Design a protein around this ligand. Structure first.
Ligand SMILES: O=S(=O)(O)c1cc(O)ccc1O
Ligand SMILES: O=S(=O)(O)c1cc(O)ccc1O
Ligand SMILES: O=S(=O)(O)c1cc(O)ccc1O
Ligand SMILES: O=S(=O)(O)c1cc(O)ccc1O
Ligand code: NI
Ligand code: NI
Ligand code: NI
Ligand code: NI
Ligand SMILES: [O-]
Ligand SMILES: [O-]
Lengths: 570, 122, 100, 570, 100, 100
């Protein structure tokens, strides 16, 4: 029997060489390899393969190489490849990527991917499956922000705040032992993975370190608290001792120093540079030059992504109103003009495309959109393909190279930056089963099903009173993984080694899975997957023109984007 | 009689800031090629190394401007500012690490300033 | 439909604006929440129409005038902000002093 | 440098002598004093004062006089004064009212109000800050009632009920040990402070007392359970032994006695007289005479507040329909006419203004509105100013005296009445940080931010998907203080001494902060702040005319109120 | 807009009333929830117009008649109650036997 | 009114359909959620009118045509499903390929 490829892809999802459009973009991904044995594909339903004595084994107990969940026929899109496989989950972790089923009768079954009595099935045929997004620039301002993030496929929020207090509205900071404790307790009710940043400000070590011992996962240095040479230095001394990451939003005003002074304070130590382009903050006008250094892990926030015709008007005004800046005060106008620059925003699109900015993030509710990190990553990739062409490294006419470069920016790279990639950030064996299923027509726009710790937490699903789940209204809804005590097992609170050793979880009565932050201090730019470029970035102090290897980086804004008015009701 | 909800009806008079403290006017020049904006409460001797002024005259002082406002220096701009005295214990810690103690230790402050290239140590 | 959380919320604004427009059509001077709803919905419908952020910043100042609203309402509204999906994605519109 | 006053008040909030209109009322409050040092005002943001080495201290650990939270530049409106100060919070309590910042460089810093690495900031410049409202007449009928209360600045609910059972629909009663236990457990999920009232009915002590030992915070005597001489007597005997408050809704029907009989049963003991005017219940027609006695702590409920043109029509009909009363049965009509009286409702406005009724409350969902205690208190004050003029005690043309008299009615006085003012009811050092921030344009109408135990619990905030928190729709929303385990630390369950000594919290697994009820039995009318007037109130049995000091108390109803159609969508 | 919980809920009643009025305009006899929504919304819009509680108690009995609704609906509705913000604050309106 | 959970949700669909119909009336090509809302509301109003499931399966294919919607929207919508209360109780309607 042979099956033509169109019918094969309709029934089982695409196989080797087939391509799939990402939403309504111009970007095509190609299946690189397939772990199946043609004819022994797994599938579930009436008269289907995963039935007892057939594709389901009826002999083995759960302990005996049997899965808790099998995602059948997934098109994985990951830094590690774009390929077709079954994904096996057990104890909340990804345990096998390969071919699931019953070795009694099927060829090619991965030995620990047996479908048995204990196994649940999710059909992923015709879906794209990615790792959950890792957003490392979250202001905790409004709890309604969590569902917003889940609906766009984000599964881990790193940042700070105590709700809509002014410190939290400006900065990703939960300050001090008591606010940290209080927010770790609040986290017990948030259906997403979380890590909390303390205030990376002080001139003595003890006030800063005590936040790490209290359960912070990292620190945030922000100009609004004084991004001075001393605060920078002390924070990095603490981080180096504690093995956690430090994020920085530098001194825009250049008050205590220019960029070179901030770099001298850093003194070669590892740091995550937030909104490196600078519209979101940092040394005016040249902060983006940070992204050329080997010790800098550079991220963008999302409202500048990508450069569009409404971007500058929107930002100038947002900046002016948030800072109580007056249109008739020339210092306020000069400040806005020094900070919102079409020249650095345009270059930022290209720096992403070149693998010079390694990460995306949101800046949720401070100057960024909680549910648009994934969305805007792909809009950027699409704009770049249109303006720059397929990258040289591509072949078969696919956009695989660019797709891996871009998916890395919101999955594995933030996870590496933050010291949490042993748990999350990619679809690999041994990592936590945080998985997002996408219909390709909705890819990067609205997630189908979001799996947290191996149980669905969020889904686009219909009328709960209906005979079946698909009738209208189909909307994003919290699923059983969020309910009761299951919220504890499906989510991870990331904490410093020292707070864990000191028994903070037991002291606070935390029931969530506790994740350890580690291996954050001896990484650099070279460790950012597909985005590892170091170079001399020059930003002209007079014209703001950006150069890399003596070539000016200029780009046009676009009037329309994909993943926009076709999809959204507002 | 038109009602503006929550409106103020402020009293007569003006509010004098930093009353009773010594004021000092000095000239300051931004010798760098990027703008520098300086807040009301930063110990003035510890500002950006590229601002050129008599650094001694910034010791124990800050800008005499309303709390939470800032003075701006465009690249190449020279202008006069007015300083007032620090209060409380008159100690500064941190910021640029020039002081880390009493502001009375002028020679120590200037020595560190000079060694690190803060312009205008005279 | 695949509604996300913001889409569901923002339906409320449209609804409040419809309610407010009916109140205005029968001759009522509008109150604070009415006025905010009308101007907000106008911005989001404007984005849907494909207008620019700069056009909506201008137009939003001429949707309602002082004789359309109760005493004090103009001075209560310092600005109105809304995000919507333009042809080039979500953008923020801020309309300062919409009712003079 | 001098700053003119208009600009000073725009930047920092108002200072000494400046006045502020309360919403759209005619009421003006004047700043009496200011704790600041002009020039060293605290503020937070880019290039602002609260930065490391500047207005933020970078030396001190949290234990060392450093705050967990500083509310900068608050205009406090409280029984203790109307004044400008910074408010410092630590461990969930108010620890300092004065001037916050960094003693390194600032003059006048209150010694325990250091801004340090551990400190969060809330900007209160241009806001009015009050204590959270204390509502002592709550029927627990519908859990949706809680957000309603929080949105109008109420932070403590005292009352009873088990949901929409008829006993609870009529009376603020959780009857018996088992219903009390069940409702203490329910309370674990309610994001507001709570105290539960048992049934103040029985002819033996034991059935009543066992409710106190089970965890009730007080008792409610209600005519629907038999407000007889015996039930009154036994309840007060229990209360005197247990140190809890007794509330009474007396025998409207005069079945076992007239008012003088109820007073004889009381026998000089302390009691809280609910809806003392009597439309909400009590000896027809003269119950309001209770408010003249030294042992009576008198409260009004809110639908009679203030007297308006629709009040009588609304009440007559509400009474008739709730009691299944028939328009064609003359006994039903005579009963309604004896109970709903324009003469006592009008006098009730004036008794408030005179400091003869000490407290407001809601009667939520029984015959009162959960979200209108604060609202109606101010509408009453405004009506009285319009009809009676500034009170004699005023000066500078401000309404400060009246504002303190009125704010006391829903903050400190109910707290004193109930035995909980050691914890709540005012902005004073050593009390729980239950604080409500108001924009003056919305004062008493819609709260900006409600702080519970030092963390924001509720806020008027916008689109959670936006770049910033202010875009529409701006609505009331639960914040992080309500989420997960943080709900336990931010709220207080008030309980009897005996239930606490007997280990009820551990027996039920209560995780909330446990507050002790105490010092309720040796207070009287003289202990009601700004509302301490005792007098002979005469109510004419034939005409219902009310006299105090031989003068008839008459007042007109009004056709319009402030804090009404300008604000509400429905 | 600063919507409070009741404002958000009550938008639902307006919406149901709009839905019901469209059903009536195309010739349907109205059902129980339709009829309740129409009468309720009429009361709250009436308060917004500045009518008195007594006027709305009278008018609410003439919004829908028996020929506008399905068999049995008049006898299912013993009364309709609504609270709304009048010029003098929130008041309760009860309309007894609205459909005879 | 005694609204149950589904009644409350489904009010949202009517509202989105009203919004979408206004967008279409001012000349916009409709998007994915707009189109789904319009067709869904048409089905539920149809059931309310007393039409049969078979009539709505036919009619639902003629509510919107390709020139009413944006490029790609017809191919994004494989079917639309809705449950509503017919004269003979709740039934499911599925409209396959509603927009050709
Ligand atoms: O603090 S606010 O919530 O009012 C805010 C307003 C604004 O215009 C920009 C940012 C903000 O955080
Ligand atoms: O390739 S191009 O140099 O023409 C280019 C155009 C553009 O609009 C943005 C980036 C670019 O590299
Ligand atoms: O018990 S009910 O919920 O039906 C009720 C109806 C009523 O007309 C007045 C009060 C009430 O508690
Ligand atoms: O002061 S008056 O005696 O004229 C008065 C009028 C009024 O309408 C209500 C209360 C009053 O004390
Ligand atoms: Ni930032
Ligand atoms: Ni940020
Ligand atoms: Ni009562
Ligand atoms: Ni009551
Ligand atoms: O940021
Ligand atoms: O009551």
């Amino acid at each position: 029997m042979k099956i033509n490829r169109q019918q094969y892809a309709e029934s089982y999802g695409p196989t080797v060489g087939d391509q799939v459009r990402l939403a309504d973009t111009d970007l095509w991904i190609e299946v690189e390899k397939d772990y199946t044995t043609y004819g022994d594909e797994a599938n579930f339903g009436g008269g289907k393969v995963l039935r007892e004595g057939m594709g389901e084994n009826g002999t083995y107990t759960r302990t005996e190489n049997v899965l808790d969940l099998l995602l059948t026929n997934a098109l994985i899109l990951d830094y590690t490849g774009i390929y077709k496989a079954d994904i096996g989950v057990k104890d909340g972790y990804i345990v096998g990527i390969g071919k699931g089923g019953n070795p009694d009768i099927m060829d090619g079954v991965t030995p620990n991917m047996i479908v048995g009595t204990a196994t649940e099935v999710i059909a992923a045929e015709g879906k794209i499956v990615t790792a959950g997004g890792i957003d490392t620039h979250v202001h905790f301002i409004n709890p309604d922000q969590v569902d917003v993030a889940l609906a766009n496929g984000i599964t881990t929020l790193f940042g700070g705040g105590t709700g809509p207090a002014e410190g939290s509205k400006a900065t990703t900071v939960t300050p001090g032992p008591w606010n940290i404790e209080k927010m770790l307790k609040s986290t017990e009710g948030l259906p997403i993975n979380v890590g909390i940043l303390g205030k990376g400000h002080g001139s003595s070590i003890a006030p800063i370190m005590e936040q790490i011992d209290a359960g912070a996962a990292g620190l945030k240095i922000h100009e609004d608290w004084g991004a001075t040479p001393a605060s920078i230095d002390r924070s990095l001394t603490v981080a180096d001792e504690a093995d956690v990451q430090v994020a920085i939003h530098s001194d825009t005003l250049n008050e205590a120093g220019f960029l070179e002074d901030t770099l001298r304070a850093i003194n070669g130590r590892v740091i995550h540079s937030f909104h490196v382009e600078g519209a979101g903050g940092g040394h005016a006008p040249d902060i983006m030059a940070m992204a050329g250094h080997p010790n800098v892990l550079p991220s963008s926030t999302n409202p500048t992504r990508p450069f569009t015709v409404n971007t500058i008007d929107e930002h100038l005004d947002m900046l002016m109103v948030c800072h109580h800046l007056k249109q008739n005060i020339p210092e306020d106008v000069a400040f806005a003009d020094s900070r919102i620059r079409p020249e650095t925003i345009a270059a930022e699109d290209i720096l992403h495309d070149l693998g010079i900015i390694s990460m995306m993030s949101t800046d949720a509710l401070a100057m960024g959109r909680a549910g648009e990190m994934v969305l805007r990553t792909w809009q950027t990739a699409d704009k770049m393909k249109k303006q720059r062409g397929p990258l040289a490294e591509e072949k078969n006419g696919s956009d695989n190279f660019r797709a891996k470069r871009y998916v890395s920016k919101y999955t594995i790279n933030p996870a590496i930056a933050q010291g949490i990639a042993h748990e999350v950030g990619s679809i690999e064996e041994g990592k936590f089963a945080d998985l997002v299923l996408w219909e390709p027509k909705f890819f990067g726009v609205k997630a189908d099903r979001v799996i947290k710790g191996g149980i669905i937490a969020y889904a686009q699903i219909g009328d709960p009173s209906a005979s079946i789940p698909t009738p209208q209204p189909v909307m994003g809804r919290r699923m059983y993984g969020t309910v009761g005590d299951l919220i504890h097992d499906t989510n991870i609170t990331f904490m410093s080694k020292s707070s864990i050793q000191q028994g903070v979880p037991a002291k606070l009565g935390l029931k969530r899975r506790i994740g350890t932050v580690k291996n954050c201090r001896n990484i650099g730019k070279k460790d950012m997957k597909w985005n590892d470029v170091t170079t001399d970035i020059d930003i002209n102090p007079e014209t703001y023109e950006v150069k890399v290897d003596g070539e000016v980086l200029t780009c046009e804004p676009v009037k329309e984007l994909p993943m926009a008015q076709r999809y959204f009701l507002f | 009689n038109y009602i503006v909800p929550g409106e103020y009806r402020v009293a007569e008079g003006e509010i004098e800031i930093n009353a009773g403290r010594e004021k000092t006017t000095i000239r300051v020049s931004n010798t760098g090629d990027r703008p520098i904006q300086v807040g009301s409460h930063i110990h003035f001797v510890e500002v950006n190394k590229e601002l050129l002024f008599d650094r001694a005259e910034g010791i124990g002082r800050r800008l005499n401007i309303p709390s939470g406002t800032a003075a701006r220096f465009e690249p190449g701009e020279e202008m006069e500012v007015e300083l007032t005295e620090l209060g409380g214990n008159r100690e500064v810690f941190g910021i640029s690490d020039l002081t880390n103690g009493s502001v009375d230790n002028k020679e120590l402050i200037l020595q560190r300033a000079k060694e690190l290239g803060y312009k205008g140590v005279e | 439909m695949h509604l996300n959380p913001a889409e569901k919320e923002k339906l409320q604004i449209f609804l409040a604006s419809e309610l407010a427009l009916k109140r205005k059509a029968r001759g009522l001077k509008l109150n604070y929440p009415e006025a905010v709803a009308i101007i907000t919905s106008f911005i989001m419908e404007g984005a849907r129409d494909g207008k620019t952020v700069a056009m909506l910043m201008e137009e939003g100042k001429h949707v309602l005038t002082r004789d359309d609203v109760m005493e004090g309402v103009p001075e209560m509204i310092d600005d109105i902000q809304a995000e919507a999906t333009f042809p080039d994605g979500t953008k923020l519109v801020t309309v300062h002093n919409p009712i003079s």
